[PDB]
Design a protein around this ligand. Structure first.
Ligand SMILES: CN(C)Cc1csc(N)n1
Ligand SMILES: CN(C)Cc1csc(N)n1
Ligand SMILES: CN(C)Cc1csc(N)n1
Ligand SMILES: CN(C)Cc1csc(N)n1
Ligand SMILES: CN(C)Cc1csc(N)n1
Lengths: 348, 348, 348, 348, 348
């Protein structure tokens, strides 16, 4: 019963695929899906994926329209595929996963996640869908999200935010904080202690603590004095050094947000995907200070201060490993005479 | 209930659209339609039309698989559209008509040829389909084909041949000779008395008369002597003159077929469409004699001899109009001292 | 050290990928790979696959240039992937398998067939490559070909022919007849007793037995008399019935080859892939007799005669299953009064 | 050693081409370069050039990431090609020059600018690169930029701004003001006296003089009074006349910037390239006043005032030639009774 | 007055560009040019070049329709560009040269070959066009063809054949044998004494000497005996050795033509361009003997016999340089005990 014309009918009348009956006239030209609306063609979808246009159209129409974990979380947890849904990746304008289970005849490797092809894959299960907690309970590999408790299983409290139709938000009218569960080879895992990235924008940056309010409001030297940060190189790492041709530090999103209020800068996202650590080719418009690979992480300033203040400062250079978004992030810590020179997410 | 996947299902299982129920997985990439057959994509259709790939695919699947009039006949008769069928043009690899009636939601201007949008268009009707003779009686404009007699309607016996799936043939197991009828502005039009082109190939040329057998077998001077053709310039017009840089004459397909047995030549079909008169950029491989626009017609040699012998040879140059395939073909007749110099389908 | 320019260098200098060092300037435009040869671009490859142009180019350069089993055999045996080679499908102008093992970084699911992702897949192993017989012994699933005996393994003698660079041939300077072995779920499977299709063309058809020579030479009634085939409907099944609008029978390639010498016909290959049984939309040019789905098999006439003469003729209709190319081909046998009416590869 | 996969590796790991060793899996689909990052394709480059996708990708990766002269300056100076670098044109999303020298095997006309093919071309040399001042000294044709003095050669002080990764800026952490030198047929040229365009944006417009601060702050009549501009048509030329259907004047960017603070307007950049004078199809959103070709120049208001006050106002219409960005810009000056009516960059 | 619609008008009415006035409606979709002929689109041109579709269309319409030197001759002579004509390469379906002189505004580097940009380029001049012999006398670099004598210029008699509209022929109604002249750096160059390749096809092969007639008619051992070729390895070099997995010898087109009459073989033209020596990936269908790079030259058998009989047979291996089509072709001559083992165009 699935068809191009039926997917298009659902998009036109329901804003997305809603299992409704009906067909609309469709025309495909190159990578674009159009529909006839009173004698003229109207664009419904432009394929930006590496899948065929009609296939990507159907997967985009069948995307999950509930708040879902951000793609970076799913990737860090080793998710290969979702059970009977499509996690659409709005950063890549493409499906987050290569294959599907019970979604599209062209991409499906199975109809149900109980089929033996899914046994080695880490299947994403959503406890908000009936029967998915039980499917995770019998799955060999999987990642489960829930809104509440699961009998016997100990939860890992996930981030406060989730993606709803490409908008990362902390839900007020919807629940976005999930309990995370993971199984590897039939064994429930104890998920590690983890920090979480805040997933904020440069243009819409809002502080989420009194320390972050003080960072944005106070001058550099009075914030450093207030929070006893002397010797931690926040002037370089967080504020940024725009005095040399190569831009110094600037690895925390809150520091880029502070700079952004004063003067603009170019951020070239050369690997445009969702990731815990982002790399930008940054050009500061005021000074002309630039850096080809400037690693940026959006940690709550308090969490970053806690991380940097919990490090031994007696070695010239070492790798500092921190669990962020369930993954191991390596940082390079450079010290001199017991003070930090730089601390940055390792470009590895 | 029409869909891309249903059209594809019919192509895969029925060799064409057969109104069957079912769907197959389809992928569209550029101008090609594929289907998954055991994990790999198999090409079903490559779009060579100016219509969208999925639209052209549906029209090609819905093509008429009965013997139908050749596109040149339909064009000569002023056919704009077909009633509830698609006349596929195998020479252009595209639908013969821009729009449809009751065939495809993207190309349809109407569901039934009785809709007022069809009134000014010359609609093609097929008497072999129930109700189509009556639809022609009520159509303001149209062309009707029938296998037999329609009470009160004066018939025009059409050509012996018709196109069946792109093969032009004189039916033995099927009827290919139709009665033709035409209406212009609600009035039945008297079709003119006409010659018909034979629709033969250069490579598969077969003589269809004793005169044609003699043309292919006898030498030039003994054929001309046998058929009393002295003074009719058959040496130039039919045999061809390969002695100068510009190829002389060579306007009858049988003459090209005779030459082809002896030595090959290049025929550039610069306007590749079905037409009563064809134009080729011909290069003779043996001599290097060539002509940018060599008009070629496939008339039965007897018909061409009858035409040329029925002309007044007392004027230097004049236009000779001959009805061929229902259209008026202009010829340029050039004479000197009561003999033909050249006679060719007038270049426009 | 694999690159687009290195694959292109190998194509230009070695006719294919040969592991040589070097690079040539390449330009990719749409689906075509070009190389600069003295200031002008020369086409190296036109992508006809659903894979990206550069990816398909690399797989085509890395195609197996030794005689390999025909794709229909591999498909019939359930082959999903090849071990460290590419079986190029010359009929589809695409790789026979979706993924690779140790061939191309874009398509590889593994470097070696011992990786756990290959365990559920039926991997094709070539005993002519060092270590591949051992790899088959440790594979959970696979198909092995060999030129000789493997101690302890019960062989299946395969067809006499193999594909060498797209040419199906019976090797004289090379071995094309292989021993076949198959494993399903770690257990060696007994390959069934089978007939083999002959893989002949209509245009280059050669008889391979005295019965086939007699079929092509004798008239229909004297061949049927010589081989005692009265009551077996060879007039319909093998010779073909061109008297009605729907073409009767014509299911054996030798019968199409016999007809082809007398008069031509159109064969529309609507699912253009390699398969034991082929389906054509056939239009006979002489009569206009046609059939949307005409199933055609190229069996040696003697094998087909043996099959049809080994059937019980006392039931109106039944399915007759025959093992051909290791697969079970269903036939529809229709009888009346102890004589065959029709026998054809069952349309699905 | 140059390859598609190596260029892609450099882009992924270094933010641009950095001569590093390594390869990443690449897929090319249409005009887009992707790389596999954990099973999914991530876009690296979308070709907007008229060069092949892989070729444009390599040139974009090999773009100059130091502050370089703006393309309009290079064009006005007659630069045809750059020595061993790529000047990327961010306004056209394409290389500024057709060919390269020592950059890419597909576009290179030479490896070194000393090769005889470069002798007639004006090669761009960068004194900040070792040996390039000496290469300019021996070049027949060229344009040289330097940060300081060149022995024997008299410099032309260029504009204060340069382009750094597509951002036009006046460097604080980097030097953007260059000394310009030019050679035609082996002879060092005396570059002319020139004004420079300021290269500002409408949205980020900042005044660069007290007169420009007063223009943006004061009302029209008090600015004209303060700067004694009565009779110079600044009301029309700089402020703009929005009272008629055709938009009057509005040829100086500062005037568009002033209007922009009050109400928005549409600027159609119908020839989107870098040029000293820009032409826009402007539609004022508040009034509906519009002009198909509104020539706009960004001159410092003081320079424009100096130019207009240095003209003879006694003729109805004449061409006024001004050297701006080293090129001759023609202006049309229209006067009546000794006062300016209009003064605009000539639409020629 | 040059336009897309005017080029299309000329193609439709004149079979090519003929400088006529007029326009036809054109539509461009992807790489195809169409024209409306009675409401439907008819394909005029499919772009197979790396140039834009409209640009390649114009160059193809403006192709030289007189017999011209074969592209291999022009390439061997170092021709970079043609004076006021387009040499169409029918083997590559593209212009033979990158740029033009006085042909198309998109590809022209000059209007006349006297412009200083043409001075370093070897310009092709055609003495059959008025003023082109004089233009060659003033050109710094060039190749001139003439039908007769140029006072003072020492001629080189070229091959008997030329290309007329893609057909290589020895003219009977047109002159195809030209006098050749070449200039390098303002100095007329003495063209070397050369053999010429015959430019024959495998399918249309005709012997051009009594020795070639005897090669095709006599058995291998009686031809070798008749022409005293014992010890020259013609069994390997010309006849071919099909006994091993790697195809032995087979480097002369006449030997491939002889084999072709007996049994077919696959010739993969992996670098499809016109060249004196061609390389094929050959697969013999009868034996399965194959060779990845089989160099093939079409020399008149007498010329090849003269070349091989004029070599010293006392060294194990040496390079033998032979001038063919004005270029120096290296051959690898392998001897043992005073007899030839192999002699083949040296693989590079
Ligand atoms: C282009 N990308 C945003 C995909 C998309 C969604 S809706 C539409 N026209 N395109
Ligand atoms: C390419 N043209 C013949 C259309 C067509 C019909 S089936 C197929 N693959 N293409
Ligand atoms: C078009 N298809 C045969 C693939 C291919 C191989 S070589 C070339 N130019 N294309
Ligand atoms: C589309 N244009 C901005 C080129 C470009 C640079 S990085 C990328 N994906 N495209
Ligand atoms: C496809 N190639 C032969 C170019 C061309 C000339 S005419 C036409 N339709 N295409």
């Amino acid at each position: 019963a699935m068809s191009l014309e039926n997917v298009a009918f659902n998009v036109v009348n329901k804003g997305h695929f809603d299992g409704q009956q009906g067909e609309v006239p469709v025309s495909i030209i190159n990578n674009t899906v159009y529909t006839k609306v009173d004698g003229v063609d109207v664009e419904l979808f432009e394929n930006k994926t590496t899948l065929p246009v009609n296939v990507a159209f159907e997967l985009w129409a069948k995307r999950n329209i509930k708040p879902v974990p951000e793609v970076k979380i799913l990737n860090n947890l080793g998710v290969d595929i979702a059970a009977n849904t499509v996690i659409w990746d709005y950063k890549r304008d493409a499906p987050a996963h290569i294959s599907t289970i019970g979604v599209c005849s062209m991409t499906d490797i199975a109809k149900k996640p109980t089929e033996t092809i899914c046994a080695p894959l880490t299947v994403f299960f959503d406890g908000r869908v009936d029967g998915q907690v039980d499917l995770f309970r019998n799955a060999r590999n999987g990642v489960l999200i829930t809104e509440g408790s699961v009998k016997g299983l100990q939860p890992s409290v996930g981030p406060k935010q989730a993606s709803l139709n490409g908008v990362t938000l902390i839900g007020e009218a919807v629940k976005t904080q999930f309990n995370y569960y993971k199984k590897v080879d039939g064994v429930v895992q104890q998920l590690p202690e983890t920090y979480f990235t805040q997933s904020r924008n440069l243009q819409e940056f809002k502080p989420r603590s009194q320390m972050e309010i003080d960072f944005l409001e106070l001058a550099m030297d009075e914030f450093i004095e207030r929070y006893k940060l002397e010797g931690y190189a926040f002037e370089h790492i967080v504020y940024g050094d725009f005095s040399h041709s190569q831009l110094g530090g600037l690895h925390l999103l809150i520091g880029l947000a502070k700079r952004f209020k004063e003067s603009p800068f170019e951020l070239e996202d050369f690997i445009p995907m969702d990731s815990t650590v982002k790399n930008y080719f940054i050009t500061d418009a005021q000074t002309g200070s630039s850096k080809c690979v400037c690693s940026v992480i959006d940690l709550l300033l308090d969490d970053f201060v806690e991380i940097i203040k919990s490090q031994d400062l007696s070695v010239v250079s070492k790798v500092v490993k921190v669990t962020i978004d369930y993954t191991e992030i390596s940082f390079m810590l450079w010290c001199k005479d017991g003070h930090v020179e730089t601390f940055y997410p390792k470009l590895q």
